[PDB]
Every structure is written in C-alpha cells, then in structure tokens.
Design a binder for this molecule. Structure first.
Ligand code: ZN
Ligand code: ZN
Ligand code: ZN
Lengths: 77, 89
C-alpha cells in the first residue's frame, strides 16, 4: 500500500505524462481497481494523508482540478 | 543628475502557461502545424492552421481546439468557457 500511495502521488503531482484527461481517467480507474483487491487499508490511508500533506504544504498549482476526482473516487471506493 | 524619472505608466501583458514548446492538445508546439496537418504543405488548399487565442489567455492551434470543441467545451487547463478572442500569434 505504501508503494501504491507513492505511485498515486507521482501520478498526481504533475500530469506531464498524458496531458489530456482521457488517459489520466483510465489510469486512475486502473489504479483504483488494483487498490480494490488490496488489504491493509489503514496504512494506505495514512500514507495517502502524508502524501497530501507533502503536496499541499509545498509549491501549489499541481493540478487544481484532480483533487475533486480523487475525493470522488475515494468516496466511491 | 540633470534628468530624473519620477512617474512611470508601464503596461504589463500576461499570458498563462500555454507551453509554447508543447501544444496542450496535440503536443507539437505553439506553431509549426499540428498532429493532423504534420507536413507544411500537406495539400493546404488555402484554409488556415494558425494559433487560436481564447478569453483566458490560452493558446493552441486552431485545428486542435476546433476539433476539441466536439469532445468537451471547457478549456482543458481550466474550467472556463473557451472564446475565440484572437486568431494567429
Ligand atoms: Zn496543437
Ligand atoms: Zn492543422
Ligand atoms: Zn483556458
């Protein structure tokens, strides 16, 4: 789960790969599908919160729109 | 000194992160044709393949966002309604 959190942080910090939205949506869907067949969600949530703290307490304007998609996917999953 | 400047009325122009080196829709450049035009001539037959400027100070190829208007209707780098305030660089 820690490595999954690092991967999602790397994908969320900047969309330099896949500038458009379709491939970003597909890769996020694949990531959440992979997370679906995973246990130990507590460490995943802890590391996701740590990554949120790291990305919000640093230089801003990373995506400014993908946060809503992330929270919606977390709600639905 | 003999002449000293007291007041200044400079006008500052600003542009957003349009990425002049990579079109935010096709990823070629802010000029030099697009993905669906490629070669300079490519049977041009008049028409145009210049740059399109919106009300949000974003710039893409006219062809790129003209086609992109069928996929969505809000400029991808923001959530604003895209206008056509200028044509060409
Ligand atoms: Zn383009
Ligand atoms: Zn073109
Ligand atoms: Zn825009």
């Amino acid at each position: 789960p820690e490595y999954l959190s690092l991967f999602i942080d790397d994908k969320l910090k900047k969309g330099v790969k896949g500038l458009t939205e379709q491939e970003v949506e597909t890769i996020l869907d694949k990531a959440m599908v992979l997370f679906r067949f995973m246990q130990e969600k507590d460490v995943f949530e802890r590391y996701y919160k740590q990554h949120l703290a790291r990305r919000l307490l640093t230089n801003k304007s990373v995506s400014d729109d993908s946060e809503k998609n992330m929270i919606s996917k977390l709600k639905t999953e | 000194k003999r002449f000293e400047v007291k007041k200044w009325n400079a006008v500052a122009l600003w542009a957003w992160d349009i990425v002049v080196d990579n079109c935010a829709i096709c990823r070629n450049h802010i000029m030099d044709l697009c993905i669906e035009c490629q070669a300079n001539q490519a049977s041009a037959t008049s028409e145009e393949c210049t740059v399109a400027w919106g009300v949000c100070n974003h710039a893409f190829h006219f062809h790129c966002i003209s086609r992109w208007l069928k996929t969505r209707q809000v400029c991808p780098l923001d959530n604003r309604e895209w206008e056509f305030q200028k044509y060409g660089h």
